[PDB]
Amino acid sequence: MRLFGYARVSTSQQSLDIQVRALKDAGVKANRIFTDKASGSSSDRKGLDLLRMKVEEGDVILVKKLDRLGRDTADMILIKEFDAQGVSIRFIDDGISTDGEMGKMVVTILSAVAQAERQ
Amino acid sequence: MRLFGYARVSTSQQSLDIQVRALKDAGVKANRIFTDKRKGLDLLRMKVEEGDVILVKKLDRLGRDTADMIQLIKEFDAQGVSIRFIDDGISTDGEMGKMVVTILSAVAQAERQRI
Amino acid sequence: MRLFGYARVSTSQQSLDIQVRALKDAGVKANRIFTDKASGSSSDRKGLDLLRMKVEEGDVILVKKLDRLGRDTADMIQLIKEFDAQGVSIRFIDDGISTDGEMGKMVVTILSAVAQAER
Amino acid sequence: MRLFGYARVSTSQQSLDIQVRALKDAGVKANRIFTDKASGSSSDRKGLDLLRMKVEEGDVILVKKLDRLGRDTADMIQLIKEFDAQGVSIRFIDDGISTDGEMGKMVVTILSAVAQAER
Amino acid sequence: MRLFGYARVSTSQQSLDIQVRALKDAGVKANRIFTDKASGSSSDRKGLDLLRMKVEEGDVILVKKLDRLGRDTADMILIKEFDAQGVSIRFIDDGISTDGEMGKMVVTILSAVAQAERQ
Amino acid sequence: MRLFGYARVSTSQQSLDIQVRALKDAGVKANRIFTDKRKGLDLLRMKVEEGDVILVKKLDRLGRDTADMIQLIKEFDAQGVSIRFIDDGISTDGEMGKMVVTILSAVAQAERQRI
């Protein structure tokens, strides 16, 4: 298993820095921290793209809070594709993971919310 | 234990009789089905007691916004009352109930940032 | 031929906007501009890494000046040779310099000469 | 075309013999090799001064490397332009570089680019 | 009037340095000191050539001793040509000049010796 | 004052009578002309006295080498004796005499460096 880290902002470098420091403090080496900053460039915006290329089945991505993974709830149900790759996600602040039975609940609930959102 | 039901439409009276039948089908007595088309919800609130279980068809029947949903779930939780969201596979019993609060709190925060 | 854009940038938004605008003014689509923070390690350049995957033989990378490509002359030379080996040439907008074939063969020769004469 | 030779040399005989031999090996007559001590002032370069008087349009000055011509890149560039204005080109034996026309136009462009990127 | 300085060696840099320092100590600015060192190059050997270009009528060349001016006595009777240019020479150590009546004697005597030498 | 003459050939006896006539013509009595074809020079030397003047045709008649010349000129100088080098325009009287020593000393040094 290898730990990766994902941080995301739309605008703020500050919250970028708040997440990246957190990811290191959780134990991710600095070169395994990929970020997305919508106000950057294709590379600042393709941190997830690179991350997809680096992972292997059995690896773990750490993200600070649940809202940092996607633009929206449909967006974050990313969980499916990384689970396709056999790669688990673990949200630090909320202390939930996406693997096994707990990971099944997380998607069930999140689908419910996203379908609600469409209401 | 004691079983209630909550059904809510925006407008369709037709579908209100359709949810109500669905809950009647799940075992809920008709005097225990409360409905809105928010007095229905305010009566059921409440009416319920320790050990009761409320059946709702979907998560989006229960409340206006995820934040309103969290506040409802904690109010029922405090009393020893739980919800089954029939079509969603979700229950507020025990662990799945803690999960649901954890995840909805996180979604709700997003929305206050949206506001 | 598809045009890409590349820039080494410092840590400020100002420094990024300036480089992004310069490459957009040169005709590069916004989704084809890749940057790296100039601060960072040269075995972990995420922008070059993505750019390497997206180019095809015959494509051109535009760069504003020689210093926006490489960390130093030796770094410039190795990158020019890497991309040259993939059939991709580099074009430095402000300096006027290109590396397609002939002039391209001259540029690495002069750059090494300068490598030496400076070293 | 008559071939001349030029070298900046340090203060030792060894340093001079080495540069003189290198230009003789390149085909320059011994009486057409001019040198300046690298120590000295750039508004008093006796060798360049004599060389300037002896060249004709069409002649070529051979130099071993870029650093044997100018005190620095800015000095190299001004000298290349001076001789270029008299119809005389410079040929750097070891580096392979020449300044006759085309490549010559490229060399001052690259050299200034490097002037900048180094400065 | 302007003072110039001329120093000459066949081999020795040391006596070069012994003369140049002398020429400065006599008051010649450093950029008006031209030297010839037979073991140098065309430029090390064309110090007199440059000197001829710099002087004006009325100027003075200082040389340390009389033997430093020419290879031989016929050679040094240089005196004629610099006198053609109206430029006087003054030999420091021997305290003779080549101008006016004293300069006439110097050439008379020196011609006598050189003709003797041919004997 | 008193006038001597010195004439020297390598080999030509003919030219020895030619120099000797030239000095006789310059005013020198025949008992005062010394000749070599180095005893001639040694007699005149080394013979001479204070105030004497020696006439020689050319500078290269006088001596083997410039150094030998300087040594001769100082020996005569010390005694108050002077040389006229007829064909060369040079005299060892006074200033032109100091010049001649100065310049010949410098030429002689060159030659010791040559040796």
* Straight-line distance from the first to the last Cα atom of chain D, in angstroms, rounded to the nearest whole number: 36
Burial code (b: 16+ CB inside 10 Å, e: under 16) for F88-110 equals bebbbeeebbebbebbbbbbbbb
By 3-state DSSP, what share of chain E in percent is helix, strand and coil, each rounded to 5?
50, 20, 30
Report in angstroms the alpha-carbon separations of D4 from A33, B37, D36, D72, D101: 59, 101, 14, 21, 18
- Angle at Cα C100 formed by Cα C95 and Cα C103, nearest 5°? 60
Task: For residue D71, give how far its alpha carbon lies from the nearest alpha carbon of chain C (Å).
Answer: 10
- Please give the torsion angle defined by the CA atoms of residues A73, A78, A80 and A81, in that order, rounded to the nearest 10 degrees: 160
Q: C103 with D104: CB under 8 angstroms? A: no
Pairs across E and F, CB distance < 8 A: 55
- Technique used by the depositors: X-ray
- How many residues in chain E? 119
Q: Do residues A8 and A35 touch, judged by C-beta distance below 8 A?
A: yes
Nearest to E110 by CA among E83, E87, E26: E83
Q: How far is D108 from chain E (nearest CA, A)?
A: 27
Reading the block at residue B6, the tokens are 């909550």
| Interatomic CA distance for residues E11 and B80, integer angstroms | 111
Neighbours of chain B (3+ CB pairs under 8 A): A
**CB nearest to F106's CB, from E65, E102, E119:** E65
Tokens for E30? 């450093």
Q: What are phi and psi of A107, to 5 degrees?
A: -75, -35
Contacts with B, A 82-111, CB within 8 Å: 91, 94-96, 102, 105-106, 108-111
Residue with tokens 């925006």: B10
* Residue A46 at interface with chain C, using a CB cutoff of 8 Å: yes
Residues on chain D touching C113 (C-beta within 8 angstroms): 65-66, 92, 95, 97
At A103, list the tokens. 């990971």
Can you state the angle between helices D101-118 and D73-85, rounded to 10 degrees? 160
Query: How many whole angstroms separate alpha carbon D72 and alpha carbon F43?
Result: 74
Q: How many CB atoms lie within 10 A of CB A10?
A: 10
**Interface membership of A38 toward B (CB under 8 Å):** no
> In chain D, helix, strand, coil percent, each to 5?
50, 20, 35
From chain D, the residues in CB contact with C66 under 8 A are: 113-114, 116-117
Mutating which of A43, A46, A50 best tests the C interface, going by the most C Cβ atoms within 10 A? A43
The residue length of chain B stands at: 115
Neighbouring C-alpha atoms within 13 Å toward the C-beta of C19:
28
Size of chain F in residues: 115
The phi-psi region of residue C27 (left if phi > 0; otherwise alpha if psi is between -120 and 50; otherwise beta) is left
For residue E117, give every residue at least 6 positions away whose Cβ sits within 8 Å of its Cβ, in sequence order, or none.
Answer: E72, E73, E74
C-alpha dihedral over E45, E48, E53, E59, to 10 degrees?
160
Rounded Cα distance between F79 and F91, Å, is: 16
Hey, is the C-beta of E44 within 8 angstroms of any chain D C-beta? yes
Chain D contact present for C10, CB below 8 A: no
Chains E and D touch (3+ CB pairs under 8 A): yes
Q: Do chains A and C touch (3 or more CB pairs under 8 A)?
A: yes
Is-contact A9 A15, C-beta < 8 A? Answer: yes
- Output the CA angle B26-B31-B37, nearest 5 degrees: 85
Tell me which residues of C are annotated as active site: 10
CB F49: neighbour CB atoms within 10 A? 9
CB atoms within 10 A of CB A86: 12
CB-based contact (8 Å) between A12 and chain C?
no
Number of domains making up chain C: 1
- Give the one of E31, E39, E50 whose C-beta lies nearest to D50's C-beta: E50
**Helix, strand, coil percent values for chain F (each to nearest 5):** 55, 20, 30
> Which residue of F56, F58, F60 is the best one to mutate when testing the E interface, meaning the one whose CB has the most E CBs within 10 A?
F60
**Is residue C47 a contact partner of residue C34, using CB atoms and an 8 Å limit?**
yes
Is F58 close to E116, i.e. CB distance below 8 A?
Answer: yes
Angle between helix axes B94-114 and B66-79 (nearest 10 degrees) is 150
- Strand F33-36 with F2-8, pairing: parallel
| Contact list, A116 vs chain B (CB under 8 Å) | 58-60, 66
The label of the residue with tokens 């002037």 reads D115
Which residues of chain D does E13 touch, with a Cβ-Cβ cutoff of 8 Å?
Answer: 13
Q: Is E65 on the interface with F (CB under 8 A)?
A: yes
Q: Is residue D32 within 8 Å of D4, Cβ to Cβ?
A: yes
Q: How far apart, in Å, are the Cα atoms of D11 and each of D8, D14, D39, E13, E28?
A: 10, 9, 8, 10, 22
Per CB-CB distance under 8 Å, the chain B contacts of A67 are: 106-107, 109-110, 113
Q: Are A20 and A7 in contact (CB under 8 A)?
A: yes
Cβ of residue B23 closer than 8 Å to a chain A Cβ: no
Count CB atoms within 10 A of the CB of residue B114.
Answer: 6
- Contact present, B36 and B11 (Cβ < 8 Å): no
The whole-angstrom separation of Cα C25 and Cα A101 is 52
Please list the residues that pair with A59 across neighbouring strands. Answer: none
Give the experimental resolution in Å: 2.3
A46 neighbourhood in chain C, CB within 8 Å: 50
Distances (CA, A) of F37 to F7, F48, F85: 9, 21, 19
CB atoms within 10 A of CB C8: 24
Beta carbons of E7 and E32 less than 8 angstroms apart: no
Contact D32 E42 (CB under 8 A): yes
**Residue matched to tokens 């100091």:** F98
User: What 3 state SS string does chain A have?
Assistant: CCEEEEEEECCCHHHHHHHHHHHHHCCCCHHHEEEEECCCCHHHHCHHHHHHHHCCCCCEEEECCHHHCCCCHHHHCCHHHHHHCCCEEEECCCCEECCHHHHHHHHHHHHHHHHHHCC
Give the span between the Cα atoms of C107 and C76, in whole angstroms.
Answer: 11
Instruction: Give yes or no for a contact between A6 and A51, defined as CB atoms under 8 angstroms apart.
Output: yes
CB contact under 8 A, A116 and B59: yes
Distance from CA of D114 to the nearest CA of C (A): 7
Range of the domain at D111: 1-119
Q: Which residues contact B33 (CB under 8 A, 6 or more apart)?
A: B4, B5, B6, B7, B20, B23, B24
The answer to whether residue E71 neighbours chain F at the CB level (below 8 Å) is no
Nearest residue to F92 (alpha-carbon basis) of F109, F108, F72: F72
Q: Tokens in use for C44?
A: 């972990």
Q: What is the CATH number of the domain that holds C88?
A: 3.40.50.1390
Q: Which residue of A has its CA nearest to B86?
A: A112
Total count of residues recorded for chain D: 119
- To the nearest whole angstrom, how far is the Cα of A98 from the nearest Cα of chain B? 12
Interface touch A94/B106, C-beta < 8 Å = yes
| Angstroms from D48 CA to nearest CA on chain C | 20
DSSP per position, B65-112:
SHHHHHHHHHHHHHHT-EEEETTTTEE-SHHHHHHHHHHHHHHHHHHH
Contacts of A47 in chain C (CB under 8 A): 46
Contact yes or no for A41/A90 (Cβ under 8 A) = no
- Of F60, F99, F113, which is closest to E109 when you measure between CB atoms? F99
